[PDB]
């Protein structure tokens, strides 16, 4: 393929200890004579699937575990198979974070959680609540200081506040259909954030570099950040502490907890070299120390070394916050969830959208895959078998139910009129089984200006193909067909779909 044999290319994010990781690479190189190269590309979490989708990219990819389910779903990750003895060296719950559809898809490295980081010289007793921060900022401003600065350009940092009074991503009691991005709890949290901005206690333009600089220069009493940030604070000589996030409406802030993880490119011809590196060089006391001494990892997955790091009050703080939060899902639409909420926070903070409308859009964006799949899967199946699914629609049931009713009505005419066209198209494609389904969805996408009619024709071809698959005793292929059409639709037409308020707009358009 495109990835070079006999060497290792490793990608890790720019806020992590990539110089320390390179030291581990240098030791691997010394032992074996095999080159290891560490890179930290911009927009890593977007660059990796771009290049890997064509069989290119790094042998080894590092990111929090939340992104890896999507990567695995898209066929970009190799299944990893550590022996029992190696598995038992790491905490079982860290392997859980990197299991997808029953398979391990990455090596867990470390548990990351956000904490409140405060300047002990300015603020010897950090606030226990978010609510007292406006008053604290007024006191500090009289001294030429501010109370709090953190990255507002990434939803990770604001999420703890959103989740505090009841906001959630996908319900965990998982029911993926149940999404809590625009409930009252999420709205209260984001509204508090926006009020801080409108009362000049924070600035909507604040990003990672700006907040880090302000804290490390001693201009702001507090920031919110993970363990990787501590190294630069050490260098700056600020007298800092790491503690529990403030409560909001008497409830703990609930950070989304990430497990830094290393995956192996499905297209790498160096999977055994990667395995050797990750298991016998990185995931050891010495390997993890080399990275940790560069930028702190947090609470590492390796039991032996975590027993040492656990005595650190900053790690104790980290795990305190982690226990109040929640391990991230790794479902394939986590990416779409984060994009949706990123846009909602930035738009609300800038005043481009009200909090209510911003979160409504993030709700629709986060629900889009599962809602679309429910409708499309049911349509394809009932079209293939001739009989409807009588199972309850579930959450947002009126929308799914009314969209399916609309799709049946409009779809009947589209299929009748396009029958000749569809027959010709199918014949040219030679679709025999599930391996043909992947390529099919892509071609279906292309075959300009977005409108619902074009989307009905797309789905109707899907139904036509579903009937064919049923007829040739490949009824098992219908659900991956449905999943593939859905993925194509919601990814390529995301912004338009959200602008229509999703399937509610479809129902309204054809009323
Ligand atoms: O902001 C959305 C973003 O959040 C998380 O990314 C974290 C990452 O986990 C940390 O290791 C650190 O690098 O900060 C990032 C946020 O800037 C999710 O892991 C990521 O997928 C998501 O897009
Ligand atoms: Mg809207």
Numbering used by the authors: -196 to -24, -20 to 253, 257 to 320
What's in the article?
We hereby refer to this construct bearing K194A/K197A/R201A and a two-residue GS linker as MBP-MCL1. The structure of MBP-MCL1 was determined in the apo state at 1.9 Å. The Gly-Ser linker that connects MBP to MCL1 causes a 45° bend in the nearly continuous alpha helix between the MCL1 and MBP domains. The mean B-factor for the structure is low overall (~20 Å2), but increases to 40–50 Å2 starting at L235. The loop containing three point mutations (K194A, K197A, and R201A) makes key packing interactions with symmetry-related MCL1 molecules as well as the MBP fusion protein. The breathability of MCL1 is further suggested by the disorder of residues 253–257 in α-helix four of apo MBP-MCL1.
Specifically, cell death-inducing mitochondrial permeabilization is prevented by tight sequestration of membrane-localized proteins by anti-apoptotic members of the BCL-2 family, which include BCL-2, BCL-XL, BCL-W, A1, and MCL1. In this report, we describe the development of a general and robust crystallography platform for soluble MCL1, using a combination of protein fusion and engineering strategies.
